[PDB]
Design an enzyme around this catalytic site. Structure first.
Site, PDB file in Angstrom:
ATOM      1  N   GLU A  39     -56.762 -49.666 -41.218  1.00  0.00           N
ATOM      2  CA  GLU A  39     -55.232 -49.844 -40.690  1.00  0.00           C
ATOM      3  C   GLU A  39     -54.819 -50.565 -40.375  1.00  0.00           C
ATOM      4  O   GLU A  39     -55.410 -51.432 -39.611  1.00  0.00           O
ATOM      5  CB  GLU A  39     -54.877 -48.752 -40.181  1.00  0.00           C
ATOM      6  CG  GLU A  39     -53.100 -48.263 -39.979  1.00  0.00           C
ATOM      7  CD  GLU A  39     -52.820 -47.438 -38.960  1.00  0.00           C
ATOM      8  OE1 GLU A  39     -53.473 -45.886 -39.661  1.00  0.00           O
ATOM      9  OE2 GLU A  39     -51.820 -47.614 -38.052  1.00  0.00           O
ATOM     10  N   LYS A 128     -49.525 -37.436 -36.676  1.00  0.00           N
ATOM     11  CA  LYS A 128     -49.887 -37.997 -35.642  1.00  0.00           C
ATOM     12  C   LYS A 128     -49.490 -38.011 -34.214  1.00  0.00           C
ATOM     13  O   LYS A 128     -48.677 -38.378 -34.150  1.00  0.00           O
ATOM     14  CB  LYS A 128     -49.387 -40.291 -35.676  1.00  0.00           C
ATOM     15  CG  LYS A 128     -50.708 -40.724 -35.526  1.00  0.00           C
ATOM     16  CD  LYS A 128     -49.879 -42.623 -36.169  1.00  0.00           C
ATOM     17  CE  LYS A 128     -50.017 -43.290 -34.656  1.00  0.00           C
ATOM     18  NZ  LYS A 128     -49.753 -44.485 -35.450  1.00  0.00           N
TER      19      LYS A 128
END
Length: 202
Positions: A39, A128
């Protein structure tokens, strides 16, 4: 797609580096460590350029996606430079509808049940848990009861001692950062191989 990739791999990586070189070196280092999910958080300058350059690691089998996408233009740049998924720290209805139209897996962040239910009423069922240092290990477990159909990606305060103590509580893929990406690539790449063996252990 992304759901079963996450279930199979069991770890992401949030890279925050200051140059636009030390990004590439640590991307390669973590790859050799074993981590196939990477990421690229937009705090790294020209992170769209970094994704565009790491394009070749998609060929060897890595997954490169944006991170800390806080605006629609940043989402535009990430989806142009070939990011495979989007990650934000806060809910954003605009980004969510844009990713829905463009068919890009978007993973918002939630902290409390009001934010969580506002999320679930929009379609994103796995979110998340930013931050998993404040909310803790005993939030996802204590909230299996009311909502048993959501699975979390606890991006914060993750390390060796409690890496699978959150797997026991039922998380998908503990996104890790500064525990990995800190030091020379020969150490970044050898310290990823201690998380991957420990996750594959528990």
């Amino acid at each position: 797609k992304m759901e079963e990739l996450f279930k199979k791999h069991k770890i992401v990586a949030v890279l925050r580096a200051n140059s636009v070189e030390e990004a590439k070196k640590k991307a390669l280092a973590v790859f050799l460590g074993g981590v196939h999910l990477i990421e690229i958080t937009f705090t790294v300058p020209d992170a769209d350029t970094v994704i565009k350059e790491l394009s070749f690691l998609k060929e060897m089998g890595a997954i490169i996606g944006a991170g800390t996408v806080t605006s629609v233009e940043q989402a535009r740049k990430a989806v142009e430079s070939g990011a495979e998924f989007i990650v934000s720290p806060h809910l954003d209805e605009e980004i969510s509808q844009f990713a829905k139209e463009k068919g890009v897996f978007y993973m918002p962040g939630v902290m409390t049940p009001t934010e969580l239910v506002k999320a679930m009423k929009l379609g994103h069922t796995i979110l998340k848990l930013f931050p998993g240092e404040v909310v803790g290990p005993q939030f996802v477990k204590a909230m299996k009861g009311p909502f048993p159909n959501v699975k979390f990606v606890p991006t914060g305060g993750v390390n060796l001692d409690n890496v699978c103590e959150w797997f026991k509580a039922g998380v998908l893929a503990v996104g890790v950062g500064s525990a990995l990406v800190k030091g020379t690539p020969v150490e970044v790449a050898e310290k990823a191989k201690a998380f991957v063996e420990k996750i594959r252990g528990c």
